[PDB]
Design a protein around this ligand. Structure first.
Ligand SMILES: [Cl-]
Ligand SMILES: [Cl-]
Ligand SMILES: [Cl-]
Ligand SMILES: [Cl-]
Length: 160
């Protein structure tokens, strides 16, 4: 997995917007989105966020991430994290988290990275644990069917 990264570009939107495969995945990816996902919804998210980045392998955009919160000298929080179905389990999310941690450190002088993960996302919970994130709190959210879900709020220190 040769991976590279760069800021997201308008030409990447269609591909990235195709990453969520069903309403639940979209909810995890982007809770305020409405199924079906679209390039316009993705572009609106990008405009409201910071650090929108794609991961590329063999000429293909395989992952997307950004920050939904950023506080200089303090912390950043992972926003959207989306990975192409064919590329899941291959280190794309791991790679992107590392890139976002560096950008938190460098651009925002962050001491902490926050990651929230919905309870159904076992693969996320397990990966973030492997990367040294620790659970701090559990919040209640509601899914698109109005069912109660648990949001596991995790964090990790970042040094200078
Ligand atoms: Cl930015
Ligand atoms: Cl795919
Ligand atoms: Cl991964
Ligand atoms: Cl999640």
């Amino acid at each position: 997995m040769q991976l590279s990264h760069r800021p997201a570009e308008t030409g990447d939107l269609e591909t990235v917007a195709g990453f969520p495969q069903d309403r639940d995945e979209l909810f995890y990816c982007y809770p305020k989105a409405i199924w079906p996902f679209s390039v316009a919804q993705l572009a609106a998210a990008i405009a409201e966020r910071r650090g929108s980045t794609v991961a590329v392998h063999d000429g293909q955009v395989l992952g997307f991430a950004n920050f939904y919160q950023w506080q200089h000298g303090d912390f950043c929080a992972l926003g959207n994290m989306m990975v192409a179905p064919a590329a899941r389990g291959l280190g794309v999310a791991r790679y992107l988290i590392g890139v976002m941690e560096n950008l938190a450190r460098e651009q925002y002088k962050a001491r902490l990275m926050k990651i929230s993960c919905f309870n159904a996302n076992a693969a996320g919970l397990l990966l973030y644990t492997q990367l040294g994130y620790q659970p701090r709190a559990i919040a209640e959210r509601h899914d698109p069917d109005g069912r109660r879900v648990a949001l596991i709020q995790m964090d990790k220190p970042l040094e200078p």
